[PDB]
Amino acid sequence: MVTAKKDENFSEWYTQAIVRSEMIEYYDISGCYIMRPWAFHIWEKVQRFFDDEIKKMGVENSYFPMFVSVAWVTHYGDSPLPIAIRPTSETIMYPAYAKWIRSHRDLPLKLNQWCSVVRWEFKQPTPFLRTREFLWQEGHTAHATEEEAWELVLDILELYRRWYEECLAVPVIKGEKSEGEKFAGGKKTTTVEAFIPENGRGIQAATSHLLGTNFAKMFEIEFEDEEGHKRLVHQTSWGCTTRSLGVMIMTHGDDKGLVIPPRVASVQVVIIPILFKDENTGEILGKCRELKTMLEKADIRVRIDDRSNYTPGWKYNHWEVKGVPLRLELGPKDLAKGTARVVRRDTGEAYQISWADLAPKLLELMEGIQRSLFEKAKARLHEGIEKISTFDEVMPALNRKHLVLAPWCEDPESEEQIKKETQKLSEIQATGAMKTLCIPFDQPPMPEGTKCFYTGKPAKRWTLWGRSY
Amino acid sequence: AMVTAKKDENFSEWYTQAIVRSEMIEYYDISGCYIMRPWAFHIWEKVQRFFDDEIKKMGVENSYFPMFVSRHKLEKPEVAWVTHYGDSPLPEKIAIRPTSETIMYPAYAKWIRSHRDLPLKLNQWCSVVRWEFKQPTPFLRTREFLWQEGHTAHATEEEAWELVLDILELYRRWYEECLAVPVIKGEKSEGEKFAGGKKTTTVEAFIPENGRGIQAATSHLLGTNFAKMFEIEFEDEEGHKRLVHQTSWGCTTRSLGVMIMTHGDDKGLVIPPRVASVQVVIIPILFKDENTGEILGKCRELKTMLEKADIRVRIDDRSNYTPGWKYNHWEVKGVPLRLELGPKDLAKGTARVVRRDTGEAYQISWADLAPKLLELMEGIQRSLFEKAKARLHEGIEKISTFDEVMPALNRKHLVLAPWCEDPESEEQIKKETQKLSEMTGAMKTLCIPFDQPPMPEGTKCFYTGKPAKRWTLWGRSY
Ligand SMILES: COc1cncc(-c2cc(F)cc(CNC(=O)c3cc(N4CC[C@@](C#N)(C5CC5)C4=O)cc(C)n3)c2)c1
Ligand SMILES: COc1cncc(-c2cc(F)cc(CNC(=O)c3cc(N4CC[C@@](C#N)(C5CC5)C4=O)cc(C)n3)c2)c1
Ligand code: PRO
Ligand code: PRO
Ligand SMILES: [Cl-]
């Protein structure tokens, strides 16, 4: 049972929740975490969704080696050798792209791979959020024109919005990264950002880069034109990781533990026979089995927790901590009345449902839960953003654990200065630096001559700032 | 580009040409590692979806464990050691997984307390690293490869062994039902067994052109051995602690290599319809604007019709290539069926269909296309399998004495021979066969087949002269 309370002791709540739900297991190498089925199934679900969608775009999967020509591999079982793990595979894939692309009809080229990457940062580790090894997908495409590459950047970003909002019920904000926060060596980075109210931090949910021609020039990825001229390809890359699971956990969880959106939950309905220690005669479990078969006919994912020793209250708490969206209780009166009691995890509301009506009503409830989780989260996102005009509004907003939307001149040195000055102010108040999250695609109007909230120069666009992961 | 090496003359060069010119493989600066290009990955995804669906029906759940393993857990030459980060040594070196028993089973020891926690059935899809010094072979013997490894724990041995056999049957289906590759079920010798395990079962395949057997997949009864070393125990119903009974089982991208080698021909790849991401490629014949728009439109209608019968169709309407180039391209890639549509076909209300495996052409009315192509695809799948099965049967000589061994090996055949099953004799046979051969010429056991021929009373071991125990399949091998 989760005993830390989410808003009072958030990091402790997160650690308790992810372990007591059986999502992760600890490991004797720092920064590495076992993904148990309760978490991994969620990965399987968003992976299937995204993979189906990119295949509709003509992206095809592949596998490139994990060794880059540095985590050095010096020996093979104490036989020394005469290596380097991928943090990301641009340098692994792009020589191959230079080889594969010769003329305009070789384009576009669109590849994806699902794999794990290793990033051995010294800083402190947190499961799903920032780890030594994590799973992701990385897509890399090359196009004859910049317009086509940018169109794909935006299509992928929309797919990421759907990954978060339709699968995980997490609202995100589409936007463009500042010059200082864009991918190294690219033209323009787009992103979807999420918000964590309990610590007021923005977090990058996924990222989709217009690399432009810089990588082509560096790796000599050229193609011959239709008129016979050598031209550089225009490239993109885009990635999204198991950090999505962390965001989902933080968005929907409450004081009792996780809440898993029905669309991705490994079990959608747990059937809990109200049986005590020697009560097994087959009457309750039989109807439990019948109900499982019926519900599975409607493509509902069901488990019966028929484990001998635990009380019904133990099982209720166990499955609430895991965050299964619906619980179906079947005990003796239920059996004698022909009904079952269903409790939905997000609100605790209970329904007495006739056995005939179970599969429809549950489908209904699941849609309700999934929509409600999104709408409540979207409302919290909206209540977490203060639209300001001047710098004196910044520190107050940050102390309410909010982000700010402010008019900005988009000068990069100004972003560095704002980082340093908000860090300074935070230490004197006693990680406190505030930085840009994105420049949202949805731009409110910019009245003529609006001043940048920090520099006083002419503002160019509304920019989203906050403390960050 | 097209294949020009002949499969029955320079087999190695033929294989290299077939995997490169079909766009399956790309070479890499780090020896023993290859890029797996999309055309190969499509086949991998087909067999992966099949096997994953089937183990999900058994209650196995997917998971993901770390790629790194500590020195103590690993050792409770193949193994790659991360020893430095930059110029600095790590305080303690850590290893990249060659296999995950030592990574998963400490967690198993912690998760299993009661008979109510069993069975525990997990799988993961990942890659592993076995860094041998010798010459690699794309797909078949590589330093990094993709696989699935399944790991289960049970309250009884009988239950674990049932699961071992059920997984082995899934591997038979993977090879024979999906890839159309015949395999032989059997049990490994004591010396070829998984180290630490109790009993290893296997499906073995055969490569006729070089005479070599190769393990296609493997399913181990670990028994209680690993439960002992990792202290994986459960309380039964009367409060007594018992060790669990364990299995582990794996299958890799080697299967793609075996498929290639089995069905490929002088024109290159031949993909069995069941694992072809493109079963039918439609090639519109456009020459000097003879009815361009109408031909393209009819191609799209035919694709929709075929898709409704679940046929996997691609229209190659790419402009910058000729029809003849498209023929060669999709041939070397092994697409099972090519459909051609031109002005003549447009008028007659028909299409011309060429099957990759034999080259036989058919003229088919549009209304008949779907049932006829479903039939042809079933026929191609079954024919690939049956021809390979005959080649496998012709590549095994049943013998009784050692003096028949070297002739049979020189015919590039395997031998099925009665054997006493003492391990010393397997080492002795290996050494003598190698010496007589004069890339290894040695002969080792491939498996003791489940399907045992009769053992007449008093049959002698082909090598020691002691009483034979069972028929054992031997050969040169990968
Ligand atoms: C940022 O300052 C830090 C502060 N405090 C601690 C750390 C830290 C500590 C460690 F011990 C180990 C690590 C290494 N892991 C990662 O860097 C990382 C990055 C991402 N990322 C980065 C952005 C991205 C998106 N969208 C990219 C597309 C991929 C996405 O998901 C996801 C995960 C799970 N892990 C970081 C780092
Ligand atoms: C035997 O002396 C040799 C002679 N000549 C060359 C080598 C060699 C050279 C290398 F450069 C790299 C390697 C390492 N790769 C592998 O050993 C290997 C094993 C398997 N295996 C082993 C059995 C199994 C089955 N079924 C198990 C389920 C897993 C299955 O698929 C699959 C693959 C793709 N690679 C070996 C070794
Ligand atoms: O690390 C990144 O952000 C880019 C996009 C995915 C692969 N590399
Ligand atoms: O390497 C092997 O043979 C076993 C089976 C898969 C996991 N370990
Ligand atoms: Cl946290």
What are the b/e assignments for A417-438, b being 16+ CB within 10 Å? ebbebbeeebeeeeebbbbbbb
Q: Is A241 in the pocket of ligand 1 (CB under 6 A)?
A: yes
- Say what the resolution is, in angstroms: 2.1
Contact A303, A267 (CB under 8 A): yes
* DSSP secondary structure letter of residue B174: I
Residue A418 belongs to what H/E stretch? Answer: helix A412-429
Return the bridge partners of B154, or none: B245
Binding residues of B: 162, 166
Q: Is B99 in the pocket of ligand 4 (CB under 6 A)?
A: yes
Which ligand neighbours the alpha carbon of A18 most closely?
Answer: 5
Give backbone dihedrals phi and psi of A72, rounded to 5 degrees, phi first.
Answer: -90, 140
Length of chain A: 469
Please give the order of strands across the beta sheet that includes B184-187: B61-62, B120-129, B144-154, B245-252, B212-223, B199-207, B184-187, B444-449, B470-475, B414-419, B396-398
**Token pair listed for A84:** 């380097």
Nearest to B149 by CA among B117, B121, B176: B121
- Residue B352 CB contacts under 8 Å (≥ 6 apart), including other chains: B339, B340, B341, B345, B361, B362, B363, B364
Distance CA B63, CA A41 (A): 8
Contact B422, B464 (CB under 8 A): yes
**Token pair listed for B93:** 């070196």
Q: Which contacts of A44-52 are long-range, i.e. CB under 8 A and separated by 24 or more positions?
A: A44/B62, A45/A167, A45/A263, A45/A264, A46/A163, A46/A167, A46/A168, A46/A244, A46/A264, A47/A114, A47/A137, A49/A162, A49/A163, A49/A166, A49/A167, A50/A137, A50/A159, A50/A163, A50/A240, A51/A112, A51/A114, A51/A137
**Token pair listed for B449:** 């087949």
The span from the first CA to the last CA of chain A, in angstroms, equals 27
Nearest to A330 by CA among A253, A252, A270, A406: A270
* DSSP secondary structure letter of residue B453: P
Nearest to B76 by CA among B120, B108, B106: B106
Distance CA B464, CA B63 (A): 48
Please indicate if any CB of chain A lies within 8 Å of the CB of B68: yes
Using CA atoms, how far residue A98 sits from A107, A211, A226, in Å, is 12, 15, 18
Distance CA B121, CA B100 (A): 14
Contact B187, B448 (CB under 8 A): yes
Assign 3-class secondary structure to B378-394.
HHHHHHHHHHHHHHHHH
Secondary structure (3-state) at B303? helix
Size of interface A-B (CB pairs under 8 A): 139
Distance CA B362, CA B430 (A): 52
- Residue A290 CB contacts under 8 Å (≥ 6 apart), including other chains: none
Rg (chain B; Cα; Å) = 26
**Token pair listed for B74:** 């690993």
Distance CA A169, CA A371 (A): 7
Contact B64, A40 (CB under 8 A): yes
Sign of CA dihedral B98, B101, B105, B108: positive
Contact A262, A173 (CB under 8 A): no
Length of chain B: 478
Q: How many CA atoms lie within 13 A of B254 on its CB side?
A: 26
- Residue A4 CB contacts under 8 Å (≥ 6 apart), including other chains: A12, A13, A16
- Tokens 């794909």: give the residue: A152
Distance CA A321, CA A361 (A): 24
Other CB atoms within 10 A of residue A352 CB = 10
Residue of A67, A100, A133 lying closest to B30 (CB–CB): A67
Contact B102, B149 (CB under 8 A): no
Environment class of A340 (CB within 10 Å of its CB; exposed 0-12, middle 13-18, buried 19+): buried
DSSP β-ladder status, A385-387 and B280-284: unpaired
Contact B47, B178 (CB under 8 A): yes
Residue of A nearest to B72 (CA): A28
DSSP-H helix ranges across A86-136: 90-100
Environment class of B374 (CB within 10 Å of its CB; exposed 0-12, middle 13-18, buried 19+): middle
Contact B270, B54 (CB under 8 A): no
Residue of A32, A37, A76 lying closest to B131 (CB–CB): A76
DSSP-H helix ranges across A130-242: 146-162, 214-219
Secondary structure (3-state) at A213? coil
- Residue A216 CB contacts under 8 Å (≥ 6 apart), including other chains: A142, A222, A232, A233, A234, A235
What are the b/e assignments for A366-398, b being 16+ CB within 10 Å? bebbbeebbebbeeebeebbbebeebeebbebb
Secondary structure (3-state) at B352? strand
Residue of B nearest to A61 (CA): B38
Using CA atoms, how far residue A346 sits from A242, A353, A373, A377, in Å, is 23, 18, 8, 12
Sign of CA dihedral A421, A424, A430, A434: positive
Other CB atoms within 10 A of residue A460 CB = 16
Nearest to B67 by CA among B171, B136, B149: B149
Distance CA B214, CA B194 (A): 16
* DSSP secondary structure letter of residue A130: B
Distance CA A387, CA A464 (A): 9
State how far residue A88 is from chain B, nearest Cα, in angstroms. 15
- Tokens 């600890």: give the residue: A26
Return the bridge partners of B382, or none: none
The amino acid occupying position B132 is E
Q: How many CA atoms lie within 13 A of B69 on its CB side?
A: 24
Nearest to B26 by CA among B13, B40, B37, B38: B37
- Residue B39 CB contacts under 8 Å (≥ 6 apart), including other chains: B22, B23, B24, B333
The residues placing their C-beta within 5 Å of ligand 5, an ion, are A 11, 14
Distance CA B386, CA B292 (A): 42
Nearest atom (ligand 1) to Cα of A205: 26
**Token pair listed for B440:** 């290894």
Distance CA A224, CA B304 (A): 35
Rg (chain A; Cα; Å) = 26
- Tokens 């992961």: give the residue: A469
Distance CA A359, CA A302 (A): 11
Pocket residue to mutate for ligand 1, from A33, A131, A211, most atoms within 8 A of Cβ:
A131
Return the bridge partners of A403, or none: A385
The span from the first CA to the last CA of chain B, in angstroms, equals 30
Domains (range + CATH), chain B: 1-272 (3.30.930.10), 273-378 (3.40.50.800), 396-477 (3.30.110.30)
Going through A84-124 in order, the beta strands assigned E by DSSP cover 109-118
**Token pair listed for B151:** 């790991």
State how far residue A74 is from chain B, nearest Cα, in angstroms. 7
Is the bond preceding residue A108 a cis peptide, omega within 30 degrees? yes
- CA-nearest residue for atom 8, ligand 4, is B99
Going through A391-433 in order, the beta strands assigned E by DSSP cover 403-408
Please indicate if any CB of chain A lies within 8 Å of the CB of B399: no
Q: How many CA atoms lie within 13 A of B454 on its CB side?
A: 2
Pocket residue to mutate for ligand 2, from B142, B171, B220, B247, most atoms within 8 A of Cβ:
B142
Contact B317, B296 (CB under 8 A): yes
DSSP β-ladder status, A230-232 and A24-25: unpaired
Distance CA A150, CA A391 (A): 34
Pocket residue to mutate for ligand 3, from A153, A210, A238, most atoms within 8 A of Cβ:
A238
Using CA atoms, how far residue B52 sits from A98, A134, B47, B441, in Å, is 35, 22, 8, 37
Secondary structure (3-state) at B470? strand
Distance CA A140, CA A94 (A): 9
Environment class of B149 (CB within 10 Å of its CB; exposed 0-12, middle 13-18, buried 19+): buried
**Token pair listed for B169:** 């049957």
Give backbone dihedrals phi and psi of B412, rounded to 5 degrees, phi first.
Answer: 60, 45
* DSSP secondary structure letter of residue B264: -
How far does the centroid of ligand 4 lie from the alpha carbon of residue B409, in Å? Answer: 29
* A34/B66 CB distance under 8 A: yes
* DSSP secondary structure letter of residue B477: B
- Residue B48 CB contacts under 8 Å (≥ 6 apart), including other chains: B125, B148
Supply the DSSP string of A224-250, one letter for each residue: E-TTS-EEE-EEEEEEEETHHHHHHHH
Secondary structure (3-state) at B213? strand
The amino acid occupying position B286 is L
Best mutation target among A75, A135, A137, A305 (most B Cβ atoms within 10 Å) is A75
The amino acid occupying position A262 is P
Distance CA B478, CA B473 (A): 14
DSSP-H helix ranges across A169-223: 214-219
Using CA atoms, how far residue A180 sits from A65, A195, A236, A412, in Å, is 31, 20, 19, 6
Torsion of CA B38, B42, B45, B47, to 10 degrees: -140
DSSP-H helix ranges across B22-173: 38-57, 71-74, 101-111, 157-172
- Tokens 């099982």: give the residue: A315
Q: Is B197 in the pocket of ligand 4 (CB under 6 A)?
A: no
Give backbone dihedrals phi and psi of A337, rounded to 5 degrees, phi first.
Answer: -105, -10
Residue B90 belongs to what H/E stretch? Answer: strand B88-96
Chain A residues with CB inside 8 Å of B85's CB? 70-72, 120
Secondary structure (3-state) at A136? strand
Distance CA B478, CA B468 (A): 26
Contact B106, B69 (CB under 8 A): no
Supply the DSSP string of A302-351, one letter for each residue: EEE---SSS-HHHHHHHHHHHT-SEEEEE-HHHHHHTEEEEEETTT--EE
Contact B476, B409 (CB under 8 A): yes
Distance CA B281, CA B313 (A): 6
Nearest to B339 by CA among B278, B279, B282, B276: B282
Distance CA B224, CA B246 (A): 7
Q: How many CA atoms lie within 13 A of A72 on its CB side?
A: 13
Please indicate if any CB of chain A lies within 8 Å of the CB of B121: no
Q: How many CA atoms lie within 13 A of B182 on its CB side?
A: 18
Nearest to B341 by CA among B384, B305, B380: B305
Chain B residues with CB inside 8 Å of A41's CB? 61-62
Assign 3-class secondary structure to B354-417.
EECCCCCEEEEEHHHHHHHHHHHHHHHHHHHHHHHHHHHHHCEEECCCHHHHHHHHHCCCEEEE
Return the bridge partners of B201, or none: B187, B219
